[PDB]
Amino acid sequence: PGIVELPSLEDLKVQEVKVSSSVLKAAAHHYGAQCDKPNKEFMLCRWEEKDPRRCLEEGKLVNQCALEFFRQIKRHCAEPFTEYWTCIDYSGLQLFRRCRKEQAQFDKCVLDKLGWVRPDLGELSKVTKVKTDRPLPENPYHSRARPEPNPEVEGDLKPARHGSRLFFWTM
């Protein structure tokens, strides 16, 4: 067949969000609140193109907007966030429910210094709409032309010409 095209290693260099999973899980509700638009443009491009090579730049925007999400935490509320993700980080299942007062301190300092409202129960699971400028893929599966169907039956049904025509049976 053909050669599969791959992007170069410079096309894959972006500054990584090099924080732990409890750090990501601690700020995840405010992350889904504040980093909505580039994340949803990326996941729309990712379910529509069905190809990650066509989804690099939007992904870079994700990694552009996540870092600016954490810098904006690090400039303002580094200590209550640190006290919060440490308590998230203790738990083996990483329970939100074991960590409600540290969550309250982090949410208080974030609403005071950044004005961010934490999403409620049922908001980040909504199907939202995304206004992009990229065109709709007319053939995301790269499917070739389908075979033409067999001709259907038409014409009025006539009797059998002289019956069964089986050796001597005249009907």
Place this chain on the structure above:
Amino acid sequence: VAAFLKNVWAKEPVLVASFAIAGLAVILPTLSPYTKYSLMINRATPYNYPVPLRDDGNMPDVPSHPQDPQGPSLEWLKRL
């Protein structure tokens, strides 16, 4: 209807408790008002990603953000 029932409750109380609990388990979800909320909670549980829609221009019932007031809500679950 009460002579046979008292007779089987005096002879076989294990089977009377068995048929009674089985009958309650059969008929009671058709009478409970909370059976609707079981269905509602099991469809409100987001196991998958809420895959976004391309904004065609006319989808007023679809939000543009999770914190927008339109869309499905879970206030019925936060209150109960």
Place this chain on the structure above:
Amino acid sequence: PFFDVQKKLGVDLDHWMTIQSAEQPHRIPARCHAFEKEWIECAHGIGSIRAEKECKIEFEDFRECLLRQKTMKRLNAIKRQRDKLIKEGKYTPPPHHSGQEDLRP
């Protein structure tokens, strides 16, 4: 005989477990969902005789997704030439294929 009771009565007895491209619990795709979808949409309605010869490429792509014989054959060829150049000494593994580079994300 195939007395098609399920289509005559309009009931779905066992069409759901029949293919991998059907509706799965929690929208789980199979690994060869796209290939099986392409081959089913190729071979639909044209009959099996025309399907065996006119949908050969989709069926070969789908069978090779299922069994991965060509992919394992290519990995065998690359790993065997690599083992030969390691035994001869004309090749050395890079630090990202020896485990000395502290992976990306």
Place this chain on the structure above:
Amino acid sequence: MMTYIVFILSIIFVMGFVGFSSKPSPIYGGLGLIVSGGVGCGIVLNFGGSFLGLMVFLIYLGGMMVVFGYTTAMATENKVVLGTFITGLLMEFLMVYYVLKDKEVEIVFKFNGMGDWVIYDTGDSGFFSEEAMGIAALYSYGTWLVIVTGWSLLIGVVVIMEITRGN
């Protein structure tokens, strides 16, 4: 050596069947089938079928081979056996030598000789085992399957009580 562990279990699985299809007695045939069920269960567990592996342990070994050993106890109180055993073992070890010296073999089908760790998938499934939710789908999507299986088991109870009566 640890990368081929599924393969290694499969060899024991083949050996286990030649362990009991040689048939010294239904006693030792049952013992060989129980060891074979354990190692094939290890094969199943190493692909992520944890519920199906515990169905091998709970239902096949813990449920059914118990009844085979029970009936072997109550109802049933060399050269051919050992020869068939060593014959099948020589056949299987020559197959292992072929597929390890060649990394390709054809007995009936064409078979690769690398390990089956390559043929997996690189994704995740979120907060569920896909195999667990597919078995949970027996009650939501598998209605007709539950109907025919429950009717077959009810008929199975009735049929056992018919033919064990003798009247």
Place this chain on the structure above:
Amino acid sequence: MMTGRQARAPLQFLPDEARSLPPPKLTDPRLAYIGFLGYCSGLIDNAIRRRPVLSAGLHRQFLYITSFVFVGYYLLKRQDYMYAVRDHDMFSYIKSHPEDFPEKDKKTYREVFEEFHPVR
């Protein structure tokens, strides 16, 4: 053979287009033979239970003849329908493929040379 035809509307004994075909008359000789099979069935039924063969159960022989004619009428309708479908598919396939059925040129016997084999 024709199993892809009656797979779009399966389990139809008589389809709707079967109503465009002429139904058999009640004096169809096939249907009269089926009624004679019913009369033979009534006679064998009186023979195997030691009844008077031509005398006993005239209502029973009447229901034998009636039931065989009743079943055979719809069986003959389906028979005529399936041969009509066979000819319809044949003719529509010949019309949709003119290259496979060429109009071969009719030569009269004045051009056709046949070898004479004398009987002597």
Place this chain on the structure above:
Amino acid sequence: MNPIILIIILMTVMLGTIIVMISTHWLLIWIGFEMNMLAIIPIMMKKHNPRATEASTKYFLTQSTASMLLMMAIIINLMFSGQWTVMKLFNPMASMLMTMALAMKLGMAPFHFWVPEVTQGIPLSSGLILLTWQKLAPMSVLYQILPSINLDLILTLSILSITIGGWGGLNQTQLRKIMAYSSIAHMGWMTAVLLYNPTMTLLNLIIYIIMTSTMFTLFMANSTTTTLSLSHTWNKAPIMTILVLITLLSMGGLPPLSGFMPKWMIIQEMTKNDSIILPTLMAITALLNLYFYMRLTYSTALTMFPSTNNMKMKWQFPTTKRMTLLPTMTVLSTMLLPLTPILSILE
């Protein structure tokens, strides 16, 4: 056996055949065969004697081995196609294993070695069920997989069944074994025309079921299981000898009887496909089963026999046995050839 339980078990036999006939998923095909076997095992053990236990054990082992080979065929189909539709198979190894497994379920040669034994050990009604109703489901699966059936395998199995069913019944005095070798020969006749025209396969199946049902119903009506007890029938009921005469002449294929109808059509559908030698030697072998039928009705049905004095007691009692559908089945098993173009309703 309790008649309610008998009704439930017969409905489960019918239900398993229906599940094999209607289902689109191979697992449900396998389930229908499992249900059918599990339900038919008590019908064979109705009288509770050691011959029925031997027959049921042999039937269990053959149908269980066939069911495991069927599931292995389905599983190789899943390897090489990733799906489960009951249609053509996607591997010749699955094709061979499923043809072998269905040949074991039908009793075709070389897996014929249970059909004369099991039919001998079980009563006449359960042998009727075995030789008629248990043929419907594997012929349905063979009807749906015929784009994948290897021609050489199905013709080898077919002509081997026809030869073994021909040369196995020459030696037989037991009526159930004559019917069983006749079963093996007729399944060869059904499966040899399968890849040419499956409508004639269905025609042979229905005419065979009618003639076999006629023969077992006459056997139950006379309570005769051997040739010599069949010879003692004319002094009790003379019409029953006439009916076993005309029905055994029909099962071998005499014109102008109805059992000549399928196989003639089968020859008529094998010379279209330019096979001349194969239906020729096939009907040569059918002449041998017709020939021992003509010995088994000339020597031992027509010319009247020495009787016993206790038969003169049995003159004073009529048959109270429910001979269900027996005149209809006897007319249909003999006098149906003028309606030979009825076969188009099976298309």
Place this chain on the structure above:
Amino acid sequence: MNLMITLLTNFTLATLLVTIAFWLPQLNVYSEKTSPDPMGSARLPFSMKFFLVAITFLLFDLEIALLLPLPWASQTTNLNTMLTMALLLIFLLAVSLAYEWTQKGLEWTE
């Protein structure tokens, strides 16, 4: 991986203790015994009822095997169908028990 370590450790400790138990008093030279049971040498008669309770276990264990994915099946979105099939399976287990009851299959080991 750590599971196989644990299983192998338990099998190793059991085999160690069983071998020490079978061979620490075999160091002793105690005495050699000749020693020349309720039944003497009669063949073990088959008990039909023991086989019937074993097969009844096997069939109800299969019905249990069908019942086993119910905590996961309660998480479905088709709860009416799921609840119906769950009650149907436990009812069919109860019907198999009722037929085992009323046909005297549960007698003398009731």
Place this chain on the structure above:
Amino acid sequence: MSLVYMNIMMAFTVSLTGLLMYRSHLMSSLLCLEGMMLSLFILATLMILNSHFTLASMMPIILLVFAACEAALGLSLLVMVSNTYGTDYVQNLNLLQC
């Protein structure tokens, strides 16, 4: 293809040849039959888990349940033979040769 599939099929064919021509205990034949079922379970499980075809995960349990019910049926036949001859030797099952 996959190499573990060859071993599972070879196990199936070993137990299939163990079922077919030995003429031994009947229980040994039932053991070979359930070894065939065991290898079918393992092979169906590895295929369905390999392809991530979720709806067929309930398929091997079905393959277990029916066949184990089948196994129960076979044991009862054996017990009837064990109530007739005192042994399960299949050469006692030769009444129906004539």
